[model samples]
Target: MAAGQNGHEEWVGSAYLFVESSLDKVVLSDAYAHPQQKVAVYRALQAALAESGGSPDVLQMLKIHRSDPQLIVQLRFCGRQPCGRFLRAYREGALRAALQRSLAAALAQHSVPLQLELRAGAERLDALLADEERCLSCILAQQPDRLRDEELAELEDALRNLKCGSGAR
Candidate 1:
């Protein structure tokens, strides 16, 4: 891929998401994780702005919190049942976009070699869901309907791990 091609490609997917009246379940949670996820989000947002004639300062004072690690806990507490994972994906997608743009800008200004792992499109949602779901399955094969006290504690822990703090945004 050419320089910044990944960002551009990821943008294409996210751009579709931002303005579309309805999500195509087939492609709704299309991208996940930073860099690529961020690309998708940024592209969607860029396209969204263009379509809606939004502010040129779209990149300024724009705070989007797409990271929701609690999603893993939510899925598990919901127990064996799959629901709203796609929304989680969207949230994650938006965060990825923000991280990517910030990182890209920093890399350019500082002339530092980007950490290869930081590149977008390195990970996928299915992989994360399957891995996390398998762990949750160890606790219960059926839906818990309500989260237990222990589960609540775990959820809080997971939330703490969300890619925030340290002045994220």
Candidate 2:
């Protein structure tokens, strides 16, 4: 669904990397509903590392969750370490498209409206996808960002250098 016009929104962050099952429950459900082309929901966390483009160590801050009924995706980015660089990595290309596809598929499975909030500090930097008017807005909304071209390219370059083994530094 499109974001609430009221501006008051509900948000949560969960993970499988940690013993945060409540959060994992939400994130995994979304991953589960992803595509047959990718890993199953239970393995979404592992699958996401490549899409994220950074090693777990470099990701100082992040959140992943799947909401019930509504399934609105809320991924908040913070810390100098992860936001710009992280967003840049998956903003476009095959992996980025796959991730966005995952989000769309998840929204479709739940039959919920879809919205993706990209925030920086107190201000919401962008609403990359907002599907409320069309019956399959979720699917149609996968148009990807045209404006982020330059910015995403720079970020992708930086994230590509991130590697845990060989210190790939």
Candidate 3:
């Protein structure tokens, strides 16, 4: 690709996920200039989905390699039973489990409503995740340090709540 072809040269690697709306299947793609960029872009895409919300019918994430300036996309389809649904469910469950562990640690030092608050928080999180405005705002922010303390706290609380609602504490 030419310099500044899309937007920035540093953004040389990207991953896209295409979901089959009716069948719960997924097609994952990787686009990058270098070999090392592959793993980084892949993990970032996964983490972005895990942190933000449920996977969508179509999703793309851009990554900056800071070391190269070319792009080519390779695609693959999920052929397993349940297609890519298993990946989504498994990642979500794993994230919830990790959050629940943290909440349990916090509870050991302080007191709070265990069940009701968690369910409500989880519900709010789902809504927020589904809202592109809210979701994109946080996701596009430059870095973790740039996020306001209140937003960070709210996000953390929501994660805890979601973990609670997803499984037994």
Candidate 4:
């Protein structure tokens, strides 16, 4: 990281470091289809994590309701500060792919779709930021000379960063 001594650079005073383990859920809907398959399901899941190189901290079974007809896979992530860093550490693609890819493969013999759910923390904020921009544009339009164009560029970069955590990919 080079210091910008040339000084011909836009200034951004603040940086946001979102370091939280993203909580995710993967449902194996057809996991308990058979009466005696609970043991097989649990056994298969152990191998899934073993082969994926994932830990129980990031991937684990949370609940088993016999009437629910599903297996709730509660995923908690961390390493740096015990954070698997899935939430803000990595973008969606690289983040979830690491777990789900091998996880799906692990359960393939049992044949169940990996019904995953990840909360869109960034996208939710992104939308709220967009709404703010829409309102700002309306106000700023009234005075063009007070041009916040450079700041707008910085804002765009912020949005892009949120969209992609490579913002590491």
Candidate 5:
């Protein structure tokens, strides 16, 4: 019996470290057709980890449940402060690729073919700071430059050191 409608399978779990494991497994729970097969699924995963010089013991947290038609397995590591950094990066990478394809297609439509660097985190912040500086200059030009040279320099420095929008002074 499947946990999903009409034998449809669904998996609910976060196994980011599985990719970092020795076998570099890419298993999806939704790929399984039967809820009972979950035992085999996890068993195979454990075996793979063992064969690949890895251990499931590091996954400090794990839960398996069958809800109606969904077999859910919630797995995690580092119980104290586990952050799914690998999963975050993987999702970001996939989204970035998709966005790049769309951007390329749009540019091609406009006949203005060019490259784009889809940066995130600190890289995006640096570019934003540059834009702010340019805008500040424009505003200053419109006004009568009320700020002192030192004051303007200080503002520029603050923008440069903007840490996640929290201006690291």
Candidate 6:
């Protein structure tokens, strides 16, 4: 897929999130969120972004951790124009709001008082897969919902072996 030094190059964007709540949920417990709640927030945020114009096809889920969840997106070549400008603007304006607001709206289930933060993504994919941090990130991006434990385990083992083999030369 024409990664670098090819006919075309695509720009990528990453987004990080933080969900804050009051006394009940407490600080940074958002990443510790329940599985059902995780899906609910994702579904809700997706819809919110859909309400805006021309968001990416899928905002790939990259990382889930104590403080935040990471999202990776590709701004494709559309109508023969690079989408970075429009998408990045949206990320700053409505896109960011939709993300935070959507999660807050989702919080209604428990009436949990909440706030969310947006973050910086990477400067940079398969060569992507070569870098351990982003290797896993891209893998999770493909799943978009994290993955079933057993499946990720198998896949990760495959990478470990591949890395060990490549260490040969």
The local distance difference test score of each candidate is: 0.31, 0.35, 0.33, 0.35, 0.35, 0.39
Decoy 5 TM-score against native: 0.24
**Which regions of candidate 3 are displaced past 4 Å?**
1-6, 9-124, 146-169
Backbone N/Cα/C clashes per model:
10, 3, 0, 7, 3, 1
User: At residue 84, what lDDT does model 4 achieve?
Assistant: 28
Which segments of candidate 2 are over 4 A away from where they belong?
1-43, 60-66, 70-82, 93-116, 119-122, 125-169
Question: Which pairs of residues clash in candidate 1, taking residues 3 or more apart in a chain or in different chains?
Answer: 10-40, 11-43, 14-44, 15-44, 35-120, 36-120, 36-121, 38-96, 38-97, 66-91
For candidate 5, give the lDDT of residue 167. Answer: 53
The runs of at least 3 residues in candidate 6 whose Cα sits more than 4 Å from the true structure, single-residue gaps closed, are 1-6, 21-32, 53-58, 68-115, 121-169
TM-score-wise, the better of 1 and 5 is: 5
lDDT of 2 at 75: 30
Q: For residues 1-169, what per-residue lDDT tens digits would candidate 4 score against the true structure?
A: 8774577432111112121123235323444556356445644553454344434443333322332433433332223232222233223434555566457558763222333233223333244333433322222233222133354335434533444322232
lDDT of 4: 0.35
lDDT of 3 by residue, 1-169 (tens): 4564465422111122222112113212223445455545654444444443423122322322222222322221222222234234534554564565457657782222111000112233354434434423333332222132354335434444444333555
Best by lDDT: 6
Q: Candidate 1's error at 108, in angstroms?
A: 39
Shift of residue 64 alpha carbon in model 6, Å: 3.4
Worst 10 residues of 6 by lDDT: 71-80
The better candidate by lDDT, 3 or 6, is 6
TM-score quality measure for candidate 1: 0.21
Q: For model 3, what is the error of residue 121's alpha carbon versus the real structure, in angstroms, after optimal superposition?
A: 14
Query: Global CA lDDT of candidate 2, please?
Result: 0.35
Per-residue lDDT value at 40 in model 3: 56
Q: What is the lDDT of residue 43 in candidate 2?
A: 32
TM-score-based ranking: 6, 2, 4, 5, 1, 3
lDDT of 6 by residue, 42-91 (tens): 44554444443333243323334453332222221222132233334343
